[PDB]
Every structure is written in structure tokens, then in C-alpha cells.
Write an enzyme that holds these catalytic residues in place. Sequence first.
Site, mmCIF file in Angstrom:
data_model
loop_
_atom_site.group_PDB
_atom_site.id
_atom_site.type_symbol
_atom_site.label_atom_id
_atom_site.label_comp_id
_atom_site.label_asym_id
_atom_site.label_seq_id
_atom_site.Cartn_x
_atom_site.Cartn_y
_atom_site.Cartn_z
ATOM 1 N N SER A 108 33.292 2.599 -8.064
ATOM 2 C CA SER A 108 32.028 3.325 -7.882
ATOM 3 C C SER A 108 31.532 3.781 -9.251
ATOM 4 O O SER A 108 31.273 2.918 -10.107
ATOM 5 C CB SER A 108 32.235 4.433 -6.849
ATOM 6 O OG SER A 108 30.989 4.949 -6.415
ATOM 7 N N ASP A 179 28.846 -1.264 2.493
ATOM 8 C CA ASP A 179 28.912 -0.062 1.668
ATOM 9 C C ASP A 179 27.645 0.768 1.856
ATOM 10 O O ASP A 179 26.532 0.273 1.644
ATOM 11 C CB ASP A 179 29.094 -0.450 0.200
ATOM 12 C CG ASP A 179 29.626 0.694 -0.656
ATOM 13 O OD1 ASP A 179 29.143 1.837 -0.507
ATOM 14 O OD2 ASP A 179 30.523 0.441 -1.489
ATOM 15 N N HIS A 212 32.725 1.607 1.442
ATOM 16 C CA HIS A 212 32.926 2.217 0.125
ATOM 17 C C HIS A 212 34.383 2.663 -0.018
ATOM 18 O O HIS A 212 34.720 3.848 -0.010
ATOM 19 C CB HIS A 212 31.960 3.375 -0.081
ATOM 20 C CG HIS A 212 31.803 3.777 -1.514
ATOM 21 N ND1 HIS A 212 31.207 2.962 -2.453
ATOM 22 C CD2 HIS A 212 32.169 4.903 -2.172
ATOM 23 C CE1 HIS A 212 31.208 3.569 -3.626
ATOM 24 N NE2 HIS A 212 31.785 4.749 -3.483
#
Length: 231
Positions: A108, A179, A212
Amino acid sequence: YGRTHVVRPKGTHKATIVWLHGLGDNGTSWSQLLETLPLPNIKWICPTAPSRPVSLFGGFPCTAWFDVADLSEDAPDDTEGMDASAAHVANLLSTEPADIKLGVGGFSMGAATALYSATCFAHGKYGNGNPYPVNLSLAVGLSGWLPCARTLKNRIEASPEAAQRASTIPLLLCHGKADDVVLYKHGQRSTDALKANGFSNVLFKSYNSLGHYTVPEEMDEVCKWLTANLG
């Protein structure tokens, strides 16, 4: 800066990789995943970002590699914060003898800082103009995006040796289509922005049901890709 966790290589030390956690996370949680990977010869340096006021959170402080305001595609780049974290990663990597291969990875926001580091290595300088001091063998970005894509063309076009470094550095981008934090389209545009600007060794792996987070099928591809591109 936070507290760093170092994963000692279990076999012959051949590479050192600084791994960057995501927003609000820390390096120890990532150190415990990396040490289960079938990757001997790799020393993992897992730092923790400074707990920094985040404009996206209305100024609430949490661990962040750079400041983020807004979620749009036009949002500001915190170039000062990205250069600081990129220079921090470079300082960590500068502790190895010359024969140890050096890489950077992340998830991320950490993936974003890892990819930004790769473009500083290609450019040969930070965003502030200071020279980039370390030779990166690769970079890995899981479920992230490429910061400062707007200036990437001007930075690479500043030198023919910049384009040479961009064309050879192996880059791995992984992203899940489900995601909902960092949308999959940001993974595709980051890959496209890299390829369009001379990074001709970019691999983009997609996972249809991945959100995610990470999954063992994704990490297994990371291990194979790291083994191949590190010898």
C-alpha cells in the site's frame, strides 16, 4: 521514526531488502510474514514510519511514509515527505558491504514509497535534486500506486543514463481487483506510467478476488520473482 525489526538471513547472506508497511501499520507485523517465506539469503529490514499528522485523517497522527490529502487522481504529491522516506530507506540500505544486493519493497503506502525509491534510483536524484546514493537491484509494490507520476517523464529524460537504469531495474507490481482501499485501476496506471517512461522490466500480476491484503498465492509469486531477479 518507529522501531525497526530485522530478520536475519537463515543461509548465506546475499541480499538485503527494506520492506515498508502500510498506513497505520508497523514493521514488526511485516517481519513475521517475511520470515516465513522460503527466502534464505535475504536479510529483511522492516522499519516503522513516523507517526505523522495525516491530512486524509483530518490531522490525526499515525505511522505514514508520507502525507496524503484527498483520494482523487489529482491529489497533491508530498514530495518532501516521499524524499525523506526514500532517503531513510537509502540510509538503511547503505549498511551492507558492496557485494550484497539491495532492494526495497512494501505494501500500500509502503509499496508507493518502494516504487518512488525505484524512480529516484532511475532518475539518479531525489525530488529535491540531491543525488540518490544507492544501487537498487529491484523493487516490489504490493497493492500500491506510483507517486509523482506527473514528473516522471521530465526526471527520466534528464539523462540517457537515467533511461538506462530505468530499462534494467526489475519491478514487480501486484494488485487485487477487489481492492477497496487502493483501487485496482491505480495498479494498472502505475504499471502503464512506468512502462511508458522507459521502465521496460516491469511485471504486473493481478488476482481477481484479492482485496487489500496478501494471499499465499501472491507471496509465492513474490518469492519466485525475487529468487530469479537476485540470482
